[PDB]
Design an enzyme around this catalytic site. Structure first.
Site, mmCIF file in Angstrom:
data_model
loop_
_atom_site.group_PDB
_atom_site.id
_atom_site.type_symbol
_atom_site.label_atom_id
_atom_site.label_comp_id
_atom_site.label_asym_id
_atom_site.label_seq_id
_atom_site.Cartn_x
_atom_site.Cartn_y
_atom_site.Cartn_z
ATOM 1 N N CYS A 6 0.804 -1.176 0.000
ATOM 2 C CA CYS A 6 0.000 0.000 0.000
ATOM 3 C C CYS A 6 0.869 1.272 0.000
ATOM 4 C CB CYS A 6 -1.018 0.001 1.183
ATOM 5 S SG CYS A 6 -0.308 -0.344 2.780
ATOM 6 N N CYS B 212 32.847 27.787 16.792
ATOM 7 C CA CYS B 212 32.874 28.995 15.982
ATOM 8 C C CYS B 212 34.216 29.048 15.249
ATOM 9 C CB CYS B 212 32.690 30.255 16.819
ATOM 10 S SG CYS B 212 32.861 31.704 15.731
ATOM 11 N N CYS C 72 36.062 32.357 16.581
ATOM 12 C CA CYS C 72 36.489 32.377 17.983
ATOM 13 C C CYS C 72 37.406 31.209 18.263
ATOM 14 C CB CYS C 72 35.315 32.297 18.972
ATOM 15 S SG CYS C 72 34.163 33.684 18.857
ATOM 16 N N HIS D 164 -1.576 0.958 7.520
ATOM 17 C CA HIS D 164 -2.071 0.873 6.187
ATOM 18 C C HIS D 164 -2.012 2.248 5.510
ATOM 19 C CE1 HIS D 164 -4.195 -0.631 2.577
ATOM 20 N NE2 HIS D 164 -5.140 0.320 2.716
#
Ligand code: CL
Ligand code: CL
Ligand code: ZN
Lengths: 81, 327
Positions: free
Chosen positions: B14, B209, B212, B285
């Site tokens: 399905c 970072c 930094c 289903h």
């Protein structure tokens, strides 16, 4: 004295839409990545699917295989079956 | 009445029928198949292990030449999809979004206009929009097809360091968006606002970072740099414990206006198909509700059975993938 952090960082958008930050290398496999997500989120690797640029990332491939670069986001989803 | 064919369940398929009907009612993708425009984009012939576009287009052609209540067998098509993606071998249930991702990947690779892909660079001198354009150009050097013409957009992620104030931007292509369940009375707009919200990354999630040179609290936020013609929204119905999150998400059938999430200032969509999952996380289903491109009426497609429905019956808690088309 600790083992070093990964040379590159990527994010994973988790099931609640908040991000986690992973320490990785270009050479890491998708299984390694799923293991890191398991560490952070507690979700079994066998339930995880990771989406990036429309591709579902497959075990056995590396980040480099998908040209995933710094600060990209992988989208974490599970399955409805 | 046109395109109202059922699809035989082949044994837990399905999930495959649901997605196929959603694709069948994706007007431009349907037309690419009926007009056999894929034959121009294939680079060479197929064999028995590689005829995915061929068998997909023939299923589409069959559905659009059927009389109402005909039942079509997609067994040939299934053979091709499981050859391309062997997780689909056999007769276990599978996830409809996972199938969507693999199927569109195989279709796209086979009609990719790029026949020999090229093998990164510093774009800090560019303004954001122009960096986005350059990244889009780069992506298109590797991935450029009719299928991507329809589903591919571009997300911008902005990562700002709370210490030096540097905002690093990256642009990731996307072929769908998997959205968190937000919040009572949850709307789809709440879910998209949660997806794109400023997310503070701190504690064990502090990024490093790149200015930094240490771990810093950063703010990460998404916006949409390029909106796709067809926008597929995948709702993350997965709760933390694992099991299915059954929240009723109120999505609109017309006038989903996503201009608020744009990176700059054509982001209005109308729904045309829904993939529904009912039941338990395992043993459920799938069905699809689809708007016919010609009449604008909705029908429920439940394996073999195609029945009419009111538009008022489209929105339910079982919706799992939403297929939107630009207005
Ligand atoms: Cl895998
Ligand atoms: Cl809404
Ligand atoms: Zn900084």
């Amino acid at each position: 004295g600790l083992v070093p952090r990964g040379s590159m960082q990527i994010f994973v958008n988790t099931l609640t839409g908040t991000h986690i930050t992973l320490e990785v290398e270009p050479s890491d496999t998708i299984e390694n990545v799923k293991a890191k997500i398991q560490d952070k989120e507690g979700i079994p690797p066998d339930q995880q699917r990771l989406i990036f640029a429309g591709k579902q990332l497959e075990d056995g491939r590396t980040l480099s295989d998908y040209n995933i670069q710094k600060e990209s986001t992988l989208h974490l989803v599970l399955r409805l079956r | 009445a046109q395109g109202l064919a059922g699809l035989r369940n082949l044994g837990n398929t399905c999930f495959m029928n649901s997605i196929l009907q959603c694709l069948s009612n994706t007007r431009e993708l349907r037309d690419y198949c009926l007009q056999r425009l894929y034959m121009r984009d294939l680079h060479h012939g197929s064999n028995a292990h590689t005829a995915l576009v061929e068998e997909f287009a023939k299923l589409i052609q069959t559905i659009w030449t059927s009389s109402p209540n005909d039942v079509v067998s997609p067994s040939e098509f299934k053979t091709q999809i499981q050859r391309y993606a062997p997780r689909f071998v056999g007769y276990n249930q599978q996830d409809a979004q996972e199938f969507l991702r693999f199927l569109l990947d195989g279709l796209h690779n086979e009609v990719n206009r790029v026949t020999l892909r090229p093998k990164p660079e510093n774009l800090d001198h560019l303004p954001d929009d122009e960096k986005g354009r350059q990244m889009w150009r780069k992506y298109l050097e590797r991935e450029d097809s009719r299928i991507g013409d329809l589903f591919v957009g571009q997300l911008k992620s902005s990562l700002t360091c709370t210490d030096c104030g540097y905002c690093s931007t990256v642009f990731d292509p996307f072929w769908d968006l998997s959205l968190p369940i937000a919040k009572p009375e949850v709307t789809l707009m709440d879910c998209m606002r949660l997806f794109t919200k400023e997310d503070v990354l701190d504690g064990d999630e502090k990024p490093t970072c790149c200015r930094c040179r240490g771990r810093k609290r950063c703010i990460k936020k998404f916006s949409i740099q390029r909106f796709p013609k067809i926008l597929v929204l995948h709702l993350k119905r997965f709760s933390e414990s694992t099991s299915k999150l059954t929240t009723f998400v109120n999505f609109p059938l017309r006038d989903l206006d996503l201009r608020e999430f744009a990176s700059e200032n054509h982001a209005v969509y109308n729904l045309y198909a829904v993939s529904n999952h009912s039941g338990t996380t395992m043993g459920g289903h799938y069905t699809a509700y689809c708007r016919s491109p010609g009449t604008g009426e909705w029908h429920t497609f439940n394996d073999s059975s195609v029945t009419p429905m009111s538009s008022s019956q489209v929105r339910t808690s079982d919706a799992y993938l939403l297929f939107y088309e630009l207005a």
